[PDB]
Amino acid sequence: EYTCMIPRDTHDGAFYRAVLALHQDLFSLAQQCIDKARDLLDAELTAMAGESYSRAYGAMVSCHMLSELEEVIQYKLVPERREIIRQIWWERLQGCQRIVED
């Protein structure tokens, strides 16, 4: 509901819609939902913030999730043999030098 009630503009805006089509196990659009969310954050961070660790950093965390999202849609349509994903995730997380909420 509220997702519907959210616009499709934001990084977030596209986001859950993908999640949802993925929660609906619907892909192409959701696939492209990212692609916009991609495009969103595309233009976004590219202000570059003179970034050092700067929210373009967080913006990575954002896309990082998208990737991380881009992953599951393959799990979940894969042989589950992908189970390495866990490690990969484990990696993809642990190499995150990070706080929690992320």
From Swiss-Prot:
It is linked to Smith-Kingsmore syndrome: An autosomal dominant syndrome characterized by intellectual disability, macrocephaly, seizures, umbilical hernia, and facial dysmorphic features. Focal cortical dysplasia 2: A form of focal cortical dysplasia, a malformation of cortical development that results in medically refractory epilepsy in the pediatric population and in adults. FCORD2 is a severe form, with onset usually in childhood, characterized by disrupted cortical lamination and specific cytological abnormalities. It is classified in 2 subtypes: type IIA characterized by dysmorphic neurons and lack of balloon cells; type IIB with dysmorphic neurons and balloon cells. This is Serine/threonine-protein kinase mTOR. The gene is MTOR. TPR repeats lie at residues 12-44, 45-84. Belongs to the PI3/PI4-kinase family. Coiled coil: none annotated. The kinase domain (PI3K/PI4K) is intrinsically active but has a highly restricted catalytic center. The chain holds residues 1531 to 1632 of 2549 of the full protein. Autophosphorylates when part of mTORC1 or mTORC2. Phosphorylation in the kinase domain modulates the interactions of MTOR with RPTOR and AKT1S1/PRAS40 and leads to increased intrinsic mTORC1 kinase activity. Signal peptide: none annotated. Part of the mechanistic target of rapamycin complex 1 (mTORC1) which contains MTOR, MLST8 and RPTOR. The mTORC1 complex is a 1 Md obligate dimer of two stoichiometric heterotetramers with overall dimensions of 290 A x 210 A x 135 A. It has a rhomboid shape and a central cavity, the dimeric interfaces are formed by interlocking interactions between the two MTOR and the two RPTOR subunits. Serine/threonine protein kinase which is a central regulator of cellular metabolism, growth and survival in response to hormones, growth factors, nutrients, energy and stress signals. MTOR directly or indirectly regulates the phosphorylation of at least 800 proteins. Functions as part of 2 structurally and functionally distinct signaling complexes mTORC1 and mTORC2 (mTOR complex 1 and 2). It comes from the Eukaryota. It is found in: Lysosome membrane; Endoplasmic reticulum membrane; Golgi apparatus membrane; Cell membrane. Expressed in numerous tissues, with highest levels in testis.
